[PDB]
């Protein structure tokens, strides 16, 4: 069975008994100043081409929908803001294609450089609405401001078999092609500025690389939506 | 009481609005009529006094014939039969006395012949506003508010031409009936200068006198 | 709190503006009055109090001292010139007055640099 | 005694004792599709300069607020709109200046051409913010898309003297010094495009000269202060 949902002027359609991951058994909610429902629309981003040599793709969260509408609009204006985020990752793949995605979303993502003595820029960091790829080499460390994106330290100096304990979802092609994350906010502060930290990292791996015979597509999209929930900034009047 | 004072006493008056002719030997010997309100300035005037009005229309024809010069040694030409087609907003329109436009099913017309009363037809209130506009400050060119396009009227001979030509003139008589009127306005001062727009040449305020004081 | 102090014939507007943090000043009477402010009219009041709002990064509490930081402006505009009668002189003077007005605390004593 | 008066994060202060004309006994409703309530903030136009020789002032409504906050984002952004206005125009003045103005909303205010044959052209018809000055001297014909600004016909070719059947208040000088106008919507249809449409026109107009003796501030200024009441738009989403 298949579920449409709406939100906003925007509709998306779902298998109806799709298994949704809560980030950490909390829900999205409002801060117990200005909320702001405008925003609570899908938002689609450009879709990605796994294909098989595909090391993974990355996107941080604030960044990503700076671009998008309003809440772009709202992040400029407003100095400082907290939201949750509902991710819907998909994929449109045949019977005949194989492969397995890790669907996580890591919380506070601080990446290293590949210059041991620097540390990245924003552009390395982050491409907004375009997505970062992890690479299966190793980045040289001539290389002064770029992250090291070794896929199997995930650019975080850990093991990516690890990466499970962040909320996340697995996507076997022959079991499943959807996943949907609830992400609640988690900061250390009850606010923050969207525009200098990006709360969350959203990160697709592929496990067990694409494969198909000779034929068949020799790519498989995968589609990331993303809808802010419960969405908040400053108020900007007098007392 | 003011009885008299009403805005149904004060508009429900018919008056002749349009005056042609139209001869039965020419091809093109048929009249028509734009029907407007600013043709007339005294009815122009006393609309202006509104901003938005809403009524239906009444229309009486006075067709009257006279017969022209011919060589013929005797002309006995029979009662003569005039159509009056209503062309309703967006309706096609004739060119010629012999058109498909004359033949619509859907331009209501009247088939009257001389001697008997006046012919006479009813419109209602056919815009897709909810009234009509007298003033319109803003474009479509400035002030034409293309909502007040109110149908065009068409008159011709229905008889052939026989040993001698007929020409025919008809009055067009206009009435407003169940007048609404919304947003009073100030009576217009300056002479109109033309039917299409507000325009005005500049005149004094009133009539003078040699001082302030008797 | 702000107190214009000329004479009791002068009449006049003023435009008093509040810029949040991170947004720039205005720079024009426009765009001071399409943001938060109080057309303050002299000829009808002497006195006119705004109380700005806390508006920090959910700190609760912000360093006293700050850095290259979104500050914040209050900022005054001209919205009329100052009318006045024959023999009263134009040129006056405004008086401003500041104080804490909502929950206000502070935490962690320090020595205070103005003194040697 | 002063009352001061909130909208949004606008303030204004007026006489609390003042008198306020209700256009025609209607105050502005919602249509009995999509309504805006961040509009609801006094705008203050930029204020003018009565003099001796001033003949008369006036705006078109719609066009006047086209490049005000959101209410100018919400004319470009839909196509369809209705509101209503509240008008408060205030003055200045010592005791020592005498005057007397009429302040005046003339819904569906078309206005004549200098030329005849022509029509007056957008530019000169309304300056948007800026205000649009009467003329105590007739426009020659050669000019060719100007509008007749003669104050006496008030460039409607009517008299002058009779502005006072359309919803109105007089500024006398010595009595009074503020005028407060509440305008309902009123037109032919139940919504329009407001940028090719100006439903209303403010016009003051300067019956009595500015005069004063020397030594005395040569001008009095004029402010206007429109609030947009009960605003909605036509929606944007499917059905």
């Known amino acids: 069975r298949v579920r449409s949902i709406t939100l906003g002027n925007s509709t998306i359609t779902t298998q109806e008994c799709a ?70 990752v998909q994929c449109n793949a045949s019977k005949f294609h194989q492969g397995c995605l890790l669907v996580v979303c890591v919380p506070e993502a601080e990446m290293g450089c590949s210059n041991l003595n620097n540390t990245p820029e924003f552009a390395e960091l982050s491409g907004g609405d375009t997505a970062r790829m992890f690479t299966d080499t190793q980045i040289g460390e001539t290389n002064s401001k770029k992250v090291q994106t070794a896929v199997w330290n995930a650019g975080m100096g850990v093991g990516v078999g690890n990466l499970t304990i962040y909320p996340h979802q697995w996507i076997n092609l022959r079991t499943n092609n ?62 | 009481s003011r009885s008299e004072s009403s805005i149904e006493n004060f508009l429900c008056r018919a008056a002749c609005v349009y005056y042609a002719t139209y001869t039965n ?156 009127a919304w947003v009073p306005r100030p009576p217009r001062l300056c002479q109109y200068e033309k039917q299409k727009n507000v325009n005005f040449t500049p005149t004094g305020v009133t009539t003078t006198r040699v001082g302030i004081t008797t | 709190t702000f107190m214009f102090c000329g004479s009791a014939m002068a009449t006049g507007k003023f435009l008093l503006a509040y810029s949040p943090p991170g947004a720039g000043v205005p720079k024009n009477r426009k765009d001071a009055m399409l943001g938060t402010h109080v057309i303050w009219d002299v000829g009808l009041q002497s006195s006119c109090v705004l109380c700005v709002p806390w508006i920090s990064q959910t700190h609760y509490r912000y360093v006293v001292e700050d850095e290259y930081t979104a500050a914040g402006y209050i900022t005054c505009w001209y919205q009329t010139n100052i009318v006045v009668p024959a023999d009263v002189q134009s040129s006056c003077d405004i008086l401003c007055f500041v104080s804490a007005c909502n929950d206000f605390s502070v935490r962690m004593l320090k020595d205070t640099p103005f003194i040697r």
């Open chain 2, 25 to 180: 030997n020419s091809e093109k010997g048929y009249a028509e009529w734009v029907i407007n309100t600013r043709q007339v300035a005294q009815l122009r005037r006393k609309l202006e006094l509104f901003t938005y009005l809403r009524f239906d229309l009444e229309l009486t024809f006075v067709i009257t014939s006279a017969q022209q010069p011919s060589t013929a040694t005797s002309v006995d030409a029979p009662v003569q039969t005039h159509q009056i087609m209503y062309v309703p907003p967006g309706g096609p329109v004739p060119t010629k006395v012999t058109d498909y436009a004359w033949q619509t099913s859907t331009n209501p017309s009247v088939f009257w012949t001389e001697g008997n009363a006046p012919p006479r037809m009813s419109i209602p209130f056919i815009s897709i506003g909810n009234a009509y506009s007298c003033f319109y400050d803003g474009w479509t060119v400035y002030g034409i508010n293309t909502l007040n396009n109110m149908g065009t009227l068409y008159m011709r001979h229905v008889n052939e031409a026989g040993q001698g030509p007929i020409k025919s003139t008809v009055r067009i008589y206009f009435k407003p009936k169940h007048v609404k």
């Open chain 1, 178 to 239: 959807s996943a949907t994350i609830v992400m609640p906010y988690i900061n250390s502060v009850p606010m923050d500025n969207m525009f200098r930290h990006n709360n969350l990292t959203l990160m697709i791996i592929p496990f067990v690389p694409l494969n198909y015979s000779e034929g068949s597509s020799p790519y498989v999209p995968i589609t990331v939506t993303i809808a802010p929930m419960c969405a908040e900034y400053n108020g900007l009047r007098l007392a």
């Open chain 1, 19 to 88: 298994n949704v991951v809560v980030g950490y058994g909390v829900w999205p909610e409002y801060l117990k100043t200005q909320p702001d429902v405008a925003t609570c629309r899908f938002y689609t981003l450009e879709s990605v081409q796994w294909m098989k040599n595909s090391a993974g793709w990355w996107w941080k969260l604030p960044d990503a929908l700076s671009q998008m509408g309003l809440f772009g609009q709202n992040m400029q204006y407003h100095y400082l803001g907290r939201t949750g985020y509902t991710i819907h």
